[model samples]
Target: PKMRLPTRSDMICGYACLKGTAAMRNTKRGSWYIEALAQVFSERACDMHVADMLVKVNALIKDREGYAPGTEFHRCKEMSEYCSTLCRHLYLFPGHPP
Candidate 1:
């Protein structure tokens, strides 16, 4: 008999979309998802859980509509989703020593 290490598969996976999905961008702010993500995490990561933070990010993005006057992407929308296999709650706890 031989000893072997146990395989671990606990992690979190986030997705912007599938093949037909469109990741819209803002002319001044860049990516819609990234912008919302940065804002939400920066402001709330200190105390908020990761899952809650992502919900806020999705909320912010779902309300946005493209502004290109005559382009096909005008008034387009995007949404973000996530999958987690985490067994416990995760928090950033920024500014705290490890």
Candidate 2:
């Protein structure tokens, strides 16, 4: 049930709508949701851009989070690799990369 198939329009509407809203925020609280959604949107929008750009964005995000120089989901060396591992795997296995 959790993996139910979605129609073409259904997927488009969901992502497009979310992406559109991620750009607009009038207040601090509103900006919070925008930032959260931006992380998700960027992860998905990665394949939509060039390879170099993707790496650059991920590195910048990692720096901002203060995890480490090139760490995203971790504060140290060990868990650093998983920074974008899950998102990468999801894009790879699904082969949608979109």
Candidate 3:
């Protein structure tokens, strides 16, 4: 038997923050989006679907607020979004063989 892969239409899911908004980061911690993705994937990828994982990542990013007291970006916020065309659930199944 052969494994089937998702078609182009089924692979169109994407997650991202909005445009025209600054993607905040900590000088030592790194990009908020990336950090959230890494954390969520590491913690939940084994059990959760990719779409659900990204939802958690989005929540993590949205909870962050800039701390600059006098700068223009102070207290600024960011939001993440995802566009999905997937027809089925996607799982990472980390540490398991295919």
Per-residue alpha-carbon lDDT of candidate 1 for residues 1-98, written as tens digits (9 for 90 to 100):
89864575457776664357878866788888888889999999998999888889888977988889887877878788888877777898898996
User: On residues 4-97, what C-alpha lDDT tens digit does candidate 2 reach at each position?
Assistant: 6534321111111232222223353443233544564566554543233344444443443223345453342110111221223223223454
Question: Model 1, which residues run further than 4 Å from truth?
Answer: 1-8
Score every model by TM-score: 0.82, 0.21, 0.80
Worst lDDT run of 10 residues, candidate 3, spans 7-16
lDDT for residue 82 in candidate 3, whole number 0-100: 80
C-alpha lDDT (0 to 100) for residue 46 of candidate 3 = 88
Candidate 3 lDDT by residue in tens digits, 1-98? 99877655776454456868756778988878888889898999889999899899888887888788888878888888788888899997898995
lDDT of each: 0.81, 0.34, 0.81
Best by TM-score: 1
- Number of colliding residue pairs in model 3: 0
lDDT of 3: 0.81
Instruction: Rank candidates by lDDT, best first.
Output: 1, 3, 2
Cα error of candidate 3 at position 75, Å: 1.2
